[PDB]
Amino acid sequence: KQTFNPTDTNALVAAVAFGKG
Amino acid sequence: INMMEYLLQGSVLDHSLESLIHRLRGLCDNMEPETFLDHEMVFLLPFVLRARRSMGAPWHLRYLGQPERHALVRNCVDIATSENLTDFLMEMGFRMDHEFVAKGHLFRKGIMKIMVYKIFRILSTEALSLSYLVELSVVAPAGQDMVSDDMKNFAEQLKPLVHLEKI
Amino acid sequence: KETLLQSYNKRLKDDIKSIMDNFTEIIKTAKIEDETQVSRATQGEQDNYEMHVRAANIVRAGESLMKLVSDLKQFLILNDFPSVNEAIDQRNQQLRTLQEECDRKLITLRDEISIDLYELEEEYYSSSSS
Amino acid sequence: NERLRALEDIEREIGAILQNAGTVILELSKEKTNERLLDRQAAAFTASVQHVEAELSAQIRYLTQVATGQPHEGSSYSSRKDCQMALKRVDYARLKLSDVARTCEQMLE
Amino acid sequence: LLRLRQHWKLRKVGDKILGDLSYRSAGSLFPHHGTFEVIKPLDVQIPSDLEGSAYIKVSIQKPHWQTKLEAAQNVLLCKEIFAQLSREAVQIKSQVPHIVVKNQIISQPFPSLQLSISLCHSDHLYVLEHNLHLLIREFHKQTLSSIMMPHPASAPFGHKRMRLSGPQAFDKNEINSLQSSEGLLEKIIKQAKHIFLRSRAAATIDSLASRIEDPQIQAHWS
C-alpha cells in the first residue's frame, strides 16, 4: 500500500505556502 | 471582478507517478501534455506575492489572500506583467527571501487544472522533495459552493492513487 | 465504479465456495448409512434427483465462473489505462507520420507540376497564328 | 499481451478443474480397480482449485489499486478523421492526374 | 474486442458495451451522443440515424465492422457541418440573402453565382467541399487545445496569444481583429467568393489570348 507518502505531502506542502527550504 | 480559487493538494511517490500520469491523462480530456518549467519567487513587504517566469511567456504574478466545505479558498488576484518586473519590485521596496523552480506536467479539465510537479531548491537545482505534488486549482469569479462540489467527485475518482486534502 | 469491483470479488468468492460446498456435500451424500425408516426404493430414487441437481449445480458454478473470468478480461481491456493510453498514443503517433508522409510526397507532386505547368503555360501563349 | 495470456491460461484451468472434478466422481463409481486414485485426484483438486481461486483473487487485488477509472477520454479521433481525409485529398489527386493523362493522351492521337 | 479498442473509445456500463462514437472526446459542442452498440464477430449496430452515408456536395451551378463504423462517424460529423452552417446562415447577416431549405442552404455570394451547399443523404468542386470538413476542425481545435494552457504554471486558461497581448500593450485594433473570427459560413462563402472570381479572371485571360493574336498575352500563374 505504497504509492503515497503522507509525511512527504505535509512536509512538502508546508514549503510551497511558506518557505520550508 | 475578483475571483477566489478552489485548490487542495497531495503528493505522489516516484514509482506511483508512472501510473498517475496515465491515470490523469486518460481520465481528463487533453492531447499530448506539456512539461512546464517555471521559476517562481516570493515577495514580502504581509502581502506575500508570487512572481513566476516560465521557460517566452511573460512574468505572471499572483497574490493569494488569507483563507476564507471540503475546499481551501483564499481571495486571489492574478495579473500578467511584462518583463523586468523583478527590478520593478526591487524599487518598490519588496524583498525576496527565497526562489524555487518547479518542474512537472499539468493536465486540464472543463474548469479545474491538475499540475504535477516537484519543488526544486536553488542556491544549481536540487530536489527538495522526492515525491511530486498535485493540486486542483480552480479559478472562478464570485465563488459559490456549486463549483467546489464538482471537485469532490473528481477527487474521489483520483482517491486510490493519491489521497489529497487541503491544509 | 468501486461498487462494480466489489461485486466482482463477491461473485467469485461465493462461486468458488459453491463449487467446494456442493462437491463435499455430494461426496457427503456419497456415504453409505442406515435404512432407518425410508424405503431404499424411495431413498435411492430420491437421492438420485438431489444428486443430479448437485452435479448440475456445480457446472452452473463453473459456468458462472467462466462468465466472471471472461468478464474480467473485457473489464480489464478498458480500464487498464497504462495499456490503453500507450495504445492510443502509439496509434496516434503512427497515424500522424502517414499524414506527414503523404503530404511530403503530395507537395513534391505540386512542386513538379508547378515547373511542368510553367513550361507548358508558356507554350500555349506562344502558339502562332492560332 | 501482458497478463492477458495469464488470465487466458486461468480460463483454461477452470475447464481442467471441472474435468478433474468429474473424474473424481466418475471413477468413484469404479469397482476394486484403480484403488487409491481418489487420493491423487483429490490432491489434484484441492490444490488446483485453490490455485485457480488465488489467481483470480490476485487479479482483483491487481485491479483495485492500479485501475478502475470510471470514464476514459483518449479520443484518438483528430488523427483518424484527418487521415482518411488526407487520403481523400490524395484520392482527388489520383483521378485528376489520370484525367490529365487522358487529356494529354489525346495530344498524342 | 482488443483490436476494436485501439481505434475507438469504449465505455462499458453494467456489462453493456455501449460505445462512444461522437467527437465529444476529441471535437466538441455537438449535443447528439454517438452510441455504437456491439453485439454478437462483434457486430456493431448504430442508432438507426447514422446509417445513410452522406456528403456535403458543395456544388456551384447558376474489417467489415470497421468500414461500417467509419461511415457512421462521417455521417455524424457531416450532420454537424450542415447544422453549423445552417444555424449561422439565418442567425447572422453579412449583406447576403441566405436561404434555408430542407437540406439545401441556397446563397448568392455574387450576382451570377449560386451556392448549393446541400447535404446529400442515402459541379462538385471538392476543393470547397473538402475545405468544410477541414475548416470545422480548426473551429473544434480552438477549444481544448495546447495553446489554451499557460506556459507559466499558475494562470487562468486562455488563448496564449491573447494572454500575452493584454500585458504587452497591444493596440485597440489588433486585439479586436483577432477576436472577430467569422465562424464557418463567412469563411467558405468568401472563398467561393474567390474560387470563381478567379475563374472569371482566368477564363478571360485565357480567352483573350485566342481572340487577339496581334500582341500575345502571357500569364505565368504563381
mmCIF file of N, CA, C and O in Angstrom, chain B residues 29-30 34 36 38 52 54 57-58 60 62 78 80 82 108 111 113 115 139, chain E residues 25 143-146 148-157 163-164 167-168:
data_model
loop_
_atom_site.group_PDB
_atom_site.id
_atom_site.type_symbol
_atom_site.label_atom_id
_atom_site.label_comp_id
_atom_site.label_asym_id
_atom_site.label_seq_id
_atom_site.Cartn_x
_atom_site.Cartn_y
_atom_site.Cartn_z
ATOM 1 N N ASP B 29 -9.696 15.246 -20.402
ATOM 2 C CA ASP B 29 -9.569 15.474 -21.836
ATOM 3 C C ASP B 29 -8.369 16.369 -22.110
ATOM 4 O O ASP B 29 -8.256 17.458 -21.539
ATOM 5 N N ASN B 30 -7.480 15.908 -22.984
ATOM 6 C CA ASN B 30 -6.268 16.645 -23.325
ATOM 7 C C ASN B 30 -5.553 15.905 -24.448
ATOM 8 O O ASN B 30 -5.913 14.780 -24.806
ATOM 9 N N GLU B 34 2.115 19.039 -21.751
ATOM 10 C CA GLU B 34 3.326 19.834 -21.872
ATOM 11 C C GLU B 34 4.086 19.827 -20.554
ATOM 12 O O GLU B 34 3.487 19.929 -19.479
ATOM 13 N N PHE B 36 6.039 21.815 -18.057
ATOM 14 C CA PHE B 36 6.120 23.226 -17.706
ATOM 15 C C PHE B 36 7.290 23.429 -16.753
ATOM 16 O O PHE B 36 7.343 22.810 -15.684
ATOM 17 N N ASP B 38 9.013 26.443 -14.727
ATOM 18 C CA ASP B 38 8.851 27.818 -14.286
ATOM 19 C C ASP B 38 9.712 28.078 -13.060
ATOM 20 O O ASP B 38 10.018 27.167 -12.287
ATOM 21 N N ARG B 52 6.203 34.378 -11.242
ATOM 22 C CA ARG B 52 6.668 33.164 -11.898
ATOM 23 C C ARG B 52 7.120 33.476 -13.317
ATOM 24 O O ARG B 52 6.383 34.108 -14.082
ATOM 25 N N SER B 54 8.389 31.444 -16.810
ATOM 26 C CA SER B 54 8.326 30.140 -17.456
ATOM 27 C C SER B 54 9.264 30.118 -18.651
ATOM 28 O O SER B 54 9.268 31.053 -19.460
ATOM 29 N N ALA B 57 6.872 33.197 -22.432
ATOM 30 C CA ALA B 57 5.692 33.816 -21.857
ATOM 31 C C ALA B 57 6.093 34.912 -20.873
ATOM 32 O O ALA B 57 7.199 34.901 -20.331
ATOM 33 N N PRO B 58 5.208 35.873 -20.626
ATOM 34 C CA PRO B 58 5.549 36.977 -19.729
ATOM 35 C C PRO B 58 5.477 36.560 -18.267
ATOM 36 O O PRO B 58 4.845 35.569 -17.899
ATOM 37 N N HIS B 60 4.187 36.096 -14.979
ATOM 38 C CA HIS B 60 2.863 36.068 -14.377
ATOM 39 C C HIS B 60 3.016 36.041 -12.864
ATOM 40 O O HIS B 60 3.647 35.129 -12.318
ATOM 41 N N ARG B 62 0.946 36.399 -8.983
ATOM 42 C CA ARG B 62 -0.334 36.101 -8.365
ATOM 43 C C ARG B 62 -0.253 36.381 -6.874
ATOM 44 O O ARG B 62 0.787 36.157 -6.248
ATOM 45 N N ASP B 78 -4.770 37.486 -9.865
ATOM 46 C CA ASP B 78 -3.607 37.152 -10.675
ATOM 47 C C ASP B 78 -3.554 38.081 -11.877
ATOM 48 O O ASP B 78 -4.541 38.219 -12.607
ATOM 49 N N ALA B 80 -1.103 39.393 -15.222
ATOM 50 C CA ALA B 80 0.048 39.188 -16.085
ATOM 51 C C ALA B 80 0.831 40.485 -16.219
ATOM 52 O O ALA B 80 0.252 41.563 -16.373
ATOM 53 N N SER B 82 4.650 42.303 -17.863
ATOM 54 C CA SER B 82 5.731 42.181 -18.826
ATOM 55 C C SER B 82 7.045 41.887 -18.105
ATOM 56 O O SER B 82 7.099 41.712 -16.884
ATOM 57 N N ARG B 108 -5.467 19.397 -17.782
ATOM 58 C CA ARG B 108 -6.589 20.305 -17.625
ATOM 59 C C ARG B 108 -7.897 19.536 -17.451
ATOM 60 O O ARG B 108 -7.928 18.304 -17.380
ATOM 61 N N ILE B 111 -12.959 23.096 -16.156
ATOM 62 C CA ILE B 111 -12.604 24.322 -15.450
ATOM 63 C C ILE B 111 -11.325 24.083 -14.657
ATOM 64 O O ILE B 111 -10.362 24.852 -14.758
ATOM 65 N N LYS B 113 -7.800 22.581 -13.073
ATOM 66 C CA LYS B 113 -6.494 22.216 -13.606
ATOM 67 C C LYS B 113 -5.762 21.335 -12.610
ATOM 68 O O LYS B 113 -5.817 21.573 -11.399
ATOM 69 N N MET B 115 -1.864 19.996 -11.875
ATOM 70 C CA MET B 115 -0.448 20.121 -12.182
ATOM 71 C C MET B 115 0.349 19.259 -11.216
ATOM 72 O O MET B 115 0.193 19.375 -9.996
ATOM 73 N N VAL B 139 -10.233 28.449 -10.770
ATOM 74 C CA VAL B 139 -10.435 29.892 -10.739
ATOM 75 C C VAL B 139 -11.848 30.183 -11.224
ATOM 76 O O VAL B 139 -12.235 29.757 -12.318
ATOM 77 N N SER E 25 -15.237 13.617 -27.316
ATOM 78 C CA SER E 25 -13.947 13.345 -26.693
ATOM 79 C C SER E 25 -12.830 14.134 -27.366
ATOM 80 O O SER E 25 -11.945 14.667 -26.685
ATOM 81 N N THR E 143 -11.001 24.991 -29.133
ATOM 82 C CA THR E 143 -11.218 24.542 -27.769
ATOM 83 C C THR E 143 -10.193 23.470 -27.409
ATOM 84 O O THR E 143 -9.529 22.897 -28.276
ATOM 85 N N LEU E 144 -10.069 23.214 -26.107
ATOM 86 C CA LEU E 144 -9.276 22.108 -25.579
ATOM 87 C C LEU E 144 -7.986 21.892 -26.365
ATOM 88 O O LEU E 144 -7.602 20.750 -26.634
ATOM 89 N N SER E 145 -7.310 22.977 -26.726
ATOM 90 C CA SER E 145 -6.055 22.900 -27.457
ATOM 91 C C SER E 145 -4.871 23.131 -26.523
ATOM 92 O O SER E 145 -5.022 23.498 -25.356
ATOM 93 N N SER E 146 -3.669 22.907 -27.059
ATOM 94 C CA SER E 146 -2.455 23.165 -26.297
ATOM 95 C C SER E 146 -2.165 24.655 -26.167
ATOM 96 O O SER E 146 -1.461 25.056 -25.234
ATOM 97 N N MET E 148 -4.310 26.931 -25.370
ATOM 98 C CA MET E 148 -5.068 27.475 -24.248
ATOM 99 C C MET E 148 -4.247 27.504 -22.967
ATOM 100 O O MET E 148 -4.363 28.447 -22.176
ATOM 101 N N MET E 149 -3.423 26.494 -22.743
ATOM 102 C CA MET E 149 -2.770 26.335 -21.456
ATOM 103 C C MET E 149 -1.649 27.356 -21.279
ATOM 104 O O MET E 149 -0.994 27.747 -22.249
ATOM 105 N N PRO E 150 -1.408 27.804 -20.045
ATOM 106 C CA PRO E 150 -0.363 28.808 -19.823
ATOM 107 C C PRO E 150 1.023 28.207 -19.659
ATOM 108 O O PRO E 150 1.217 27.288 -18.858
ATOM 109 N N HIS E 151 1.990 28.718 -20.416
ATOM 110 C CA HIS E 151 3.383 28.377 -20.153
ATOM 111 C C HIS E 151 3.767 28.632 -18.704
ATOM 112 O O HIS E 151 4.425 27.764 -18.107
ATOM 113 N N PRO E 152 3.413 29.760 -18.085
ATOM 114 C CA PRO E 152 3.513 29.848 -16.622
ATOM 115 C C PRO E 152 2.524 28.890 -15.975
ATOM 116 O O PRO E 152 1.348 28.849 -16.340
ATOM 117 N N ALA E 153 3.015 28.115 -15.008
ATOM 118 C CA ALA E 153 2.196 27.058 -14.426
ATOM 119 C C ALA E 153 0.899 27.616 -13.857
ATOM 120 O O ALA E 153 -0.174 27.033 -14.051
ATOM 121 N N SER E 154 0.977 28.744 -13.158
ATOM 122 C CA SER E 154 -0.177 29.340 -12.500
ATOM 123 C C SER E 154 -0.720 30.470 -13.368
ATOM 124 O O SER E 154 -0.099 31.529 -13.482
ATOM 125 N N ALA E 155 -1.876 30.234 -13.983
ATOM 126 C CA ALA E 155 -2.588 31.259 -14.733
ATOM 127 C C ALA E 155 -3.914 30.691 -15.222
ATOM 128 O O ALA E 155 -4.031 29.474 -15.416
ATOM 129 N N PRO E 156 -4.929 31.523 -15.431
ATOM 130 C CA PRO E 156 -6.196 31.008 -15.957
ATOM 131 C C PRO E 156 -6.048 30.558 -17.399
ATOM 132 O O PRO E 156 -5.216 31.068 -18.152
ATOM 133 N N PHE E 157 -6.871 29.587 -17.783
ATOM 134 C CA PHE E 157 -6.838 29.096 -19.150
ATOM 135 C C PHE E 157 -7.274 30.195 -20.106
ATOM 136 O O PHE E 157 -8.319 30.824 -19.914
ATOM 137 N N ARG E 163 -3.348 36.013 -24.037
ATOM 138 C CA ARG E 163 -2.854 36.328 -22.701
ATOM 139 C C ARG E 163 -1.591 37.175 -22.756
ATOM 140 O O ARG E 163 -1.364 37.996 -21.864
ATOM 141 N N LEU E 164 -0.749 36.973 -23.770
ATOM 142 C CA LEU E 164 0.424 37.816 -23.957
ATOM 143 C C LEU E 164 0.100 39.122 -24.666
ATOM 144 O O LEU E 164 0.960 40.007 -24.730
ATOM 145 N N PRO E 167 -0.990 42.147 -21.629
ATOM 146 C CA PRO E 167 0.115 42.687 -20.828
ATOM 147 C C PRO E 167 1.299 43.191 -21.636
ATOM 148 O O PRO E 167 2.256 43.696 -21.038
ATOM 149 N N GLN E 168 1.279 43.066 -22.964
ATOM 150 C CA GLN E 168 2.341 43.594 -23.813
ATOM 151 C C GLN E 168 1.872 44.810 -24.608
ATOM 152 O O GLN E 168 2.472 45.168 -25.624
#
